[PDB]
Structure 1
Amino acid sequence: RPPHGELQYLGQIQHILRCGVRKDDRTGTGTLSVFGMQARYSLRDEFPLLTTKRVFWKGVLEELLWFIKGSTNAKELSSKGVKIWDANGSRDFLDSLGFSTREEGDLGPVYGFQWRHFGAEYRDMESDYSGQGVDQLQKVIDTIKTNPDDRRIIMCAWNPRDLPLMALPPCHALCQFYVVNSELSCQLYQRSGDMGLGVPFNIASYALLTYMIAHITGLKPGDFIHTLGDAHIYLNHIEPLKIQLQREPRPFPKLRILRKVEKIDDFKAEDFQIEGYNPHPT
């Protein structure tokens, strides 16, 4: 009787179709669009991997793990057979940014470096930043263990000084955690969200991070609150979304963590099994 948590994402899509405004330009790109939306996804016994269309779960878990180790090296992930960042590591592409002296796959100070060493002077993908900058992930885990009530438990990836050094500016600007009755919640502030391709992955990433952090602090998962800045759909995806919005949601799968892990760095693709996941065909 509480509605399926997937109807919120589908509503947001109804909405952009009914009211976005056509920021134009049948000259490649071309979008419908709306500014500011907010969705709440339960994490209690379910795990919100969308079902009306399949999400690249393997690219989810692998990219999250590549952020936790602080990497900013795209080859290092691309070897887990997740390619989503390689176009951004390609020499012609850096070459179009004056990164002419960077080795291919050096993305600059992108999420893993902002999560692990915010503030450090960034040299390049092979340097060692041990002890430099602030480690937001750790500080966040400690504050949860020792002051769950703190209203300051934030993690920021948007670093205006580092921005001209990044091979692309981040979508997720910041996430805030929050703790009550032993449940752990999370709110992601995303500046720009493609309603078709990325938003369902981005929802999985942050839910998963919430599980992993709940696990390691011995709290139980709560709500994941997805807030969006610029939410858009590309005109070319309207047809496929229009069909996609007929499909009745299917029950969200579940996720087990298969061992007791105590440091965040300690996690490995195999500690997780997504069980029950059955989405519509594409």
Structure 2
Amino acid sequence: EKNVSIVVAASVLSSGIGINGQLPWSISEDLKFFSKITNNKCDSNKKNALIMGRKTWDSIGRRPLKNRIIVVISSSLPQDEADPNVVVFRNLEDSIENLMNDDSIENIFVCGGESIYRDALKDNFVDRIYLTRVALEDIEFDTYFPEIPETFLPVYMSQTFCTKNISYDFMIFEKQELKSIDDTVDLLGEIFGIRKMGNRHKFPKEEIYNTPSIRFGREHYEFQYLDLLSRVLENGAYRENRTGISTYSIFGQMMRFDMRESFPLLTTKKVAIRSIFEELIWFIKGDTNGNHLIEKKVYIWSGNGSKEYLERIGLGHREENDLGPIYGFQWRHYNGEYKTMHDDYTGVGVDQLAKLIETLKNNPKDRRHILTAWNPSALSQMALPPCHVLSQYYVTNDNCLSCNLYQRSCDLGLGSPFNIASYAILTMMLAQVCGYEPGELAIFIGDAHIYENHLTQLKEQLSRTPRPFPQLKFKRKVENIEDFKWEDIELIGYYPYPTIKMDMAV
């Protein structure tokens, strides 16, 4: 008995693998993966066998692959014995029976087009599936990869990679047919109740774990958000808050995302990326006028900015959407004497963002690149205290800009998908203006919570296996960071699940 794995690079949605006898794409690193996964063997005196159909054998030039043995499935090709690295069989079945019991062969790989993929799964010959999900769908395919049978479960999903602005994943699918430590920890959990901290951070149950079959291969960094949801649904304490909608809350959580090879925009739900940007540039410009977002069809600050809400918190003297000194005011005019949203605050206050950009490129290894928004002297004047209170930035030795954010209160479901992408765009903006590349984004959270009217919505989101992250590139290089416009943003390869409506708690 030996192992028979499928290697395939297919589209993310329709599972397309070819067009007009060739690939729909040219990804160098993906072919390198095919090379390394098919050469992976234990015995140096053995070789791996690569099974492929004739039309696929034509697409690779009918030339052998080093250190491997190509098995071509063809009804017409002559069974030439002159080439030992290429053998022909009349059907797929006689090429599995012959490869196994052939001690010179260690592993078997199926990789030969739709006709071979489809008949290898229908006849139950395949043990593993190496899938490369490529985020390209608005093009034309003519050969597809069959739908993965239910007998297979995913066990690994890599981080999203980027080649020529094309996002792709790497997944492993297995066919589903030390313990003394686990016993002792369970016994200690019975003796001590909540006294054992492990019981206060119980591992989420399978019913609330997104794609629970991926146990050890949760490399895709959207799991940093999906698993935080699961940890809240498992350990969240039911608590009241300033609004009429209670939450399930835990304390002290973190999420980290890559920004070099992808953009952390959630794929399990269509995230309103346009509104995220318009709010971010609204912060950068130092603007606290809530109408300037409503004038651009962005209504995320209408609830916390209505006349009825402001009178409720004792700010009835403000205009209809005068949010007061908040994120935008503290970034550009810290400790500035706020009057109204119509006054001219040029020069007043401490321009943190300007000093940040100046310090990022003049003293890159300075570990004080800090942008804060928590000003106790102005909290009473704010329509809402800052949720993302403090961010720190870091220039790596390879000229990348990483970002750390501390968030005191995190509305998973509404605020969190925005904060993940918002500070991701901000770091990219800071990276271009300072002449660096994007690095990493880590979000440290205080009150990570889920509003009780988001439960059926967020549980629906957990039922969706993540897709590769999109790409975010800028159309032009900007002089000043304030000059960014929405038209200057290109969102490449974003194929999310349908949007999920969730009401905001005012």
Verify same fold: TM over 0.5: yes
**TM range, normalised to the smaller chain?**
over 0.9
Taking the aligned partners of 2:240 and 2:381, their CA distance within structure 1 comes to 30
Q: Secondary structure at the match of 1:216?
A: helix
Cα deviation, residue 24, structure 1? 5.7
Q: 1:96 aligns with which of 312, 335, 338?
A: 312
Cα deviation, residue 28, structure 1? 4.5
Counterpart amino acid of residue 394 in structure 2: Y
Q: 1:227 aligns with which of 432, 444, 456?
A: 444
Taking the aligned partners of 1:24 and 1:123, their CA distance within structure 2 comes to 33
2:413 is equivalent to residue 191 of structure 1: no
Equivalence for 2:333: 117
Equivalence for 2:287: 71
CA distance change for structure 1 residues 95 and 31 in 2, over 3 Å: closer, same or farther? closer
Counterpart amino acid of residue 297 in structure 2: G
Equivalent positions of 1:107-256 (< 5 A) are 107-180=323-396, 181-256=398-473
Summarize deviations over 1:241-261 as a string: whole Å, max 9, x none.
223212111000001100111
Counterpart amino acid of residue 122 in structure 1: Y
| Larger radius of gyration between Structure 1 and Structure 2 | 2
Cα deviation, residue 30, structure 1? 2.2
Q: Secondary structure at the match of 2:297?
A: coil
Taking the aligned partners of 2:272 and 2:492, their CA distance within structure 1 comes to 15
TM-score calculated relative to the size of structure 1: 0.95
Summarize deviations over 1:199-231 as a string: whole Å, max 9, x none.
111111000001111111110000000110000
CA distance change for structure 1 residues 97 and 237 in 2, over 3 Å: closer, same or farther? closer
CA distance change for structure 1 residues 24 and 101 in 2, over 3 Å: closer, same or farther? closer
Q: 2:239 aligns with which of 23, 26, 29?
A: 23
Aligned residues: 281
Counterpart amino acid of residue 369 in structure 2: I
Equivalence for 1:53: 269
Taking the aligned partners of 2:394 and 2:480, their CA distance within structure 1 comes to 20
Taking the aligned partners of 1:223 and 1:8, their CA distance within structure 2 comes to 13
Q: Secondary structure at the match of 2:455?
A: helix
Percent identity among equivalent residues?
55
Unaligned runs of 5+ in 2: 1-157, 160-218, 500-506
Relative contact order, CA 8 A, sep 6+: which one is greater?
1
Cα deviation, residue 126, structure 1? 1.1
Q: Secondary structure at the match of 1:22?
A: strand
Counterpart amino acid of residue 261 in structure 2: D
CA distance change for structure 1 residues 278 and 108 in 2, over 3 Å: closer, same or farther? same
Taking the aligned partners of 2:310 and 2:454, their CA distance within structure 1 comes to 29
Unaligned runs of 5+ in 1: none
TM-score calculated relative to the size of structure 2: 0.54
Give the stretch that moved more between structures: 232-241 or 146-155.
232-241
Taking the aligned partners of 2:263 and 2:402, their CA distance within structure 1 comes to 13
Counterpart amino acid of residue 140 in structure 1: L
